[PDB]
Design a protein around this ligand. Sequence first.
Ligand code: CL
Lengths: 84, 90, 82
Amino acid sequence: KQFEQLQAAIHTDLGALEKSVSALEKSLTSLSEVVLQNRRGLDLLFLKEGGLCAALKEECSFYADHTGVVRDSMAKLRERLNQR
Amino acid sequence: KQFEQLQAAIHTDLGALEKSVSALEKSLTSLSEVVLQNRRGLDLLFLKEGGLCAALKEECSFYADHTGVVRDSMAKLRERLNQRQRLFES
Amino acid sequence: FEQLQAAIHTDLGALEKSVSALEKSLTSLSEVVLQNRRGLDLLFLKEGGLCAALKEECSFYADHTGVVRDSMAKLRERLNQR
Ligand SMILES: [Cl-]
């Protein structure tokens, strides 16, 4: 009744959320390749000083990439959203 | 019944996920502006070598931005949440 | 019906953890980026930094991830309760 309408709508909304999370993941992973190429550029420019972090006398930041979790999780979600 | 409580809970949880997806979108878009300005900086620094990617001798990485889909879908989702809570309250 | 609510539950849990994973990753990347930035500010120090040398308004990171952290934490709580 009103029940079915709501259940259908939730299904739709979960799929929209899956899609947005997956879109964010590709965007984030793409950007990360830009960022790491930038880093390689800076280690080149700072070659005589030991590289970027050595030049800054800072602890070196690395990209801790947790997006495998996202891809595996969202793929499982898409598979289950074939239940209605 | 218990069903009413659960309408309420799901509305809450979807709204929370919507808000969180949007916050992340805004943060990622903002970060990308920093990143691309960094890139222009490196392209200037390596201007004589034909740019960053040329100097690195690398295929050039570009930001595949899908955040437009995200901004659209989440606006739609807020609209739906609001419309459903409005009808329910009616 | 219990089967339905279980399916929704699992789906919401998957989304929560995925959002949280993205959050950890974005926050980590952002540190790499900011450090890159500090690097470019040193390379352009006499010209007033990167932005001045590009003749541009400066981009800064508007970090909204605290909202994501707080909000997902509560979602995990409400999900675990049920
Ligand atoms: Cl960067």
